[PDB]
Amino acid sequence: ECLGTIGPVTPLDASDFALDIRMPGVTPKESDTYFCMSMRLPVDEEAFVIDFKPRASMDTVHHMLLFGCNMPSSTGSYWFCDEGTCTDKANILYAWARNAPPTRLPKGVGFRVGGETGSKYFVLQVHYGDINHKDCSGVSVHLTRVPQPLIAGMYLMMSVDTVIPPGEKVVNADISCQYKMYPMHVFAYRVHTHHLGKVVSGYRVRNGQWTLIGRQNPQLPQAFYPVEHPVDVTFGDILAARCVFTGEGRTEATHIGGTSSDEMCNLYIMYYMEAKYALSFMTCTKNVAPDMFRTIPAEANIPI
């Protein structure tokens, strides 16, 4: 339901509050419309996101994403996300998929927001699949001023230079970076691709030995799925991902971009670190060890 007079901030206690990020009573007119809206944080000082609660209209809402960033793409009430999510790098915090119920954040793990360096805005993306009434669906977020012993963060792996020729059977997108930070522990993962993607898989390679982080079919509902067994990545380790693509069906060559006729090989690894060692976001857009992919487990090429 639409919040009305009470407003979006509910105090939970002296140092906690719930912030309701909602659609401002939207009415979609087409199938597969993507709406976005932002919420400046209510506190300027640092705070930690410790919990999320979905408030989705189960009929119309396909998936919801929740980002943190400093420059949302529009200064408006809401907008079509084709205009963009954020001008600066948008950090994903939460993915709600229809047919894949999200996993809770471990206790003591939180995303740092606000303050001098955290995210100053939340941006809510709601995808309306099937469609007069006004929709107020969104997420309810649990913020705390209390410093958390473990800090949540995102290691993002994405391809930039992949080129898929038309009708081509199999095209591999290889991403690889060496980890040069304090240890992190992977606890969830999301895969994102468009319609040409067949399988995505991320690994930790340590002394030539591949440890699976996540292996998923990008056509299946793109939520964050929990890691089978939590995995430490440590200074020296190499993170490695592959997306497997097809060109079959396409008439012209497909590159990396933002439209449906474009592609993307995106593995979001969610992790926690020790608060005093923690950093909040890492990105790999390179393939530093290409010849290493000769020993990639065979599972990464077969479709799930």
Q: Could you list the residues known to form a binding site for Cu(2+), using ranges.
A: 62-63, 127, 192, 194, 264
**Partner that binds at residue 92, options Cu ion, Ni ion, none, CB closer than 5 to 8 Å by kind:** none
127 vs 242, which CB is nearer to Cu ion?
A: 127
- DSSP H helices in the chain: none
21 touching Cu ion, by CB under 5 A: no
82 vs 232, which CB is nearer to Ni ion?
A: 232
Position closest to Ni ion via CB: 232
8-state DSSP, 296: -
Report how many residues bind Cu ion under the rule CB under 5 A: 1
Position closest to Cu ion via CB: 264
Catalytic-residue membership of 142: no
3-class secondary structure, 294:
helix
Q: Which of 47, 71, 61 is nearest to 122 (CA)?
A: 71
User: Residues 32, 82, 232, 262: which binds Ni ion (CB under 5 A)?
Assistant: 232
**Partner that binds at residue 232, options Ni ion, Cu ion, none, CB closer than 5 to 8 Å by kind:** Ni ion
Catalytic-residue membership of 58: no
For the chain, the straight-line distance linking the first and the last C-alpha, in angstroms and rounded, comes to 38
Separation between Cα atoms, residue 245 and residue 297, nearest integer Å: 17
Tokens found for residue 218: 């990008």
Catalytic-residue membership of 127: yes
8-state DSSP, 45: S
**Partner that binds at residue 264, options Cu ion, Ni ion, none, CB closer than 5 to 8 Å by kind:** Cu ion
Q: List all residues 6 or more positions away from 206 whose beta carbon is below 8 Å from its beta carbon.
A: 234, 236, 237, 238
Catalytic-residue membership of 185: no
Tell me which residues in 257-286 interact with Cu ion (CB under 5 A): 264
Catalytic-residue membership of 255: no
Which residues in the chain are followed by a discontinuity, with C-to-N distance exceeding 2.5 angstroms?
Answer: 131
Q: Which member of 39, 125, 142, 157 is catalytic?
A: 125
Among all residues, which ones are annotated catalytic? Answer: 62-63, 125, 127, 192, 194, 264
